[PDB]
Amino acid sequence: WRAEGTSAHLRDIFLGRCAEYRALLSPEQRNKDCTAIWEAFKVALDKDPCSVLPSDYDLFITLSRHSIPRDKSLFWENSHLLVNSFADNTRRFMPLSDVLYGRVADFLSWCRQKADSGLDYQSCPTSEDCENNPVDSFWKRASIQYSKDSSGVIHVMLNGSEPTGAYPIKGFFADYEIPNLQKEKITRIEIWVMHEIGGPNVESCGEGSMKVLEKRLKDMGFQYSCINDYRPVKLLQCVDHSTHPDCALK
């Protein structure tokens, strides 16, 4: 295979993450059964590593699905860590990685042996290796869910120091989330184009790809707006470049 092998102590981690996340859920929704969630998640783990479909994770999403505060969703591209860091375990925001079905699988990897019945710790199929692998189908399922369940003001943090462009016209946000946003429940969409401190300003609002994304969102009938280096997040990046001039306080 060409992707990272299945995560060590996957079950241990999974159940643990799920365990801690409960305290975060509202009482009415605290009732989650992690072992049931794990048992359901495993259904895809038993199948051929190149024959897993998003729909396989339907049961898993059923037992772990839960509400997302209006105005607290945070979609993103090329900024996984920064997103996790800023959101702060649902405190500031609630990105997919901060929703039960996302938290449990964040940064992890998994797949069954190509021929054997165990877990392949050597390597898992990437997108190229074959489309229907467990990790991709999972995130396709989870992201679709996350999008349908979002509401209010939708925020999107993009990387403007990304060589190839801020908005990947072919990533999860573009292919699986935007097509699944519920217009009736969304008031407007806000984009945060974050540039690296000092880093290359490859693209800012309304430039290049950001023009495509903007045109598409508007064509769809959404209310659009874009911000460059949204201050709160700029400050966070600054935590690691305090001496740099872009991070100097008055």
Ligand X SMILES: *[C@@H]1O[C@H](CO)[C@@H](O[C@@H]2O[C@H](CO)[C@@H](O)[C@H](O)[C@H]2NC(C)=O)[C@H](O)[C@H]1NC(C)=O
Residues that bind ligand X (CB under 6 A): 78-79, 81-82, 159, 161-163, 196, 199-200
Residue 71: left (phi > 0), alpha (psi -120 to 50), or beta?
left
Q: Should residue 134 be labelled a site residue for ligand NCA when binding is judged by CB under 6 A?
A: no
Element (H, E) at 34: helix 34-46
Q: Should residue 95 be labelled a site residue for ligand NCA when binding is judged by CB under 6 A?
A: yes
Q: Should residue 86 be labelled a site residue for ligand NCA when binding is judged by CB under 6 A?
A: no
CA 49 to chain centroid = 22
Residues in the chain, how many?
A: 250
Given the complex with a second copy, which of 92 and 216 has the nearer CB atom? 92
Q: Should residue 172 be labelled a site residue for ligand NCA when binding is judged by CB under 6 A?
A: yes
Strand partners, 241: none
Q: Which of 243, 241, 9, 237 is nearest to 110 (CA)?
A: 9
Count Cβ atoms below 10 Å from residue 45 Cβ, excluding itself.
Answer: 19
- The rounded distance, in Å, linking the Cα atoms of 191 and 53 is 31
Q: Should residue 97 be labelled a site residue for ligand NCA when binding is judged by CB under 6 A?
A: yes
Q: CB–CB of 146/68 below 8 Å? A: yes
Size of the site for ligand NCA (CB under 6 A): 8
Phi, psi of 238 (to 5 degrees): -65, -25
1 assigned to a ligand binding site:
no
Q: Cβ 78 to a second copy, closest distance in Å?
A: 19
Given the complex with ligand X, which of 179 and 198 has the nearer CB atom? 198
- The rounded distance, in Å, linking the Cα atoms of 237 and 97 is 19
Q: Should residue 106 be labelled a site residue for ligand NCA when binding is judged by CB under 6 A?
A: yes
- The tokens describing 233, both together, are 């997040």
Given the complex with ligand X, which of 78 and 209 has the nearer CB atom? 78
What residue type is assigned to position 225 of the chain? Answer: S
Given the complex with ligand X, which of 45 and 202 has the nearer CB atom? 202
Given the complex with a second copy, which of 114 and 234 has the nearer CB atom? 234
Given the complex with ligand NCA, which of 106 and 131 has the nearer CB atom? 106
Q: Should residue 165 be labelled a site residue for ligand NCA when binding is judged by CB under 6 A?
A: no
- Cα dihedral value 157, 159, 160, 163, nearest 10: -160
Element (H, E) at 56: none
Q: Should residue 143 be labelled a site residue for ligand NCA when binding is judged by CB under 6 A?
A: yes
Applying CB under 8 A, the residues found at the interface with a second copy are 8-9, 12-13, 15-17, 19-20, 22-23, 34, 85-86, 88, 92, 231-236, 238-240, 242-243, 245-250
Q: Cβ 234 to a second copy, closest distance in Å?
A: 7
- The rounded distance, in Å, linking the Cα atoms of 143 and 95 is 10
Q: Cβ 116 to ligand X, closest distance in Å?
A: 34
Q: Site residues (CB under 6 A) for ligand NCA? A: 95-97, 102, 106, 139, 143, 172
What residues are designated binding site for nicotinamide? 76
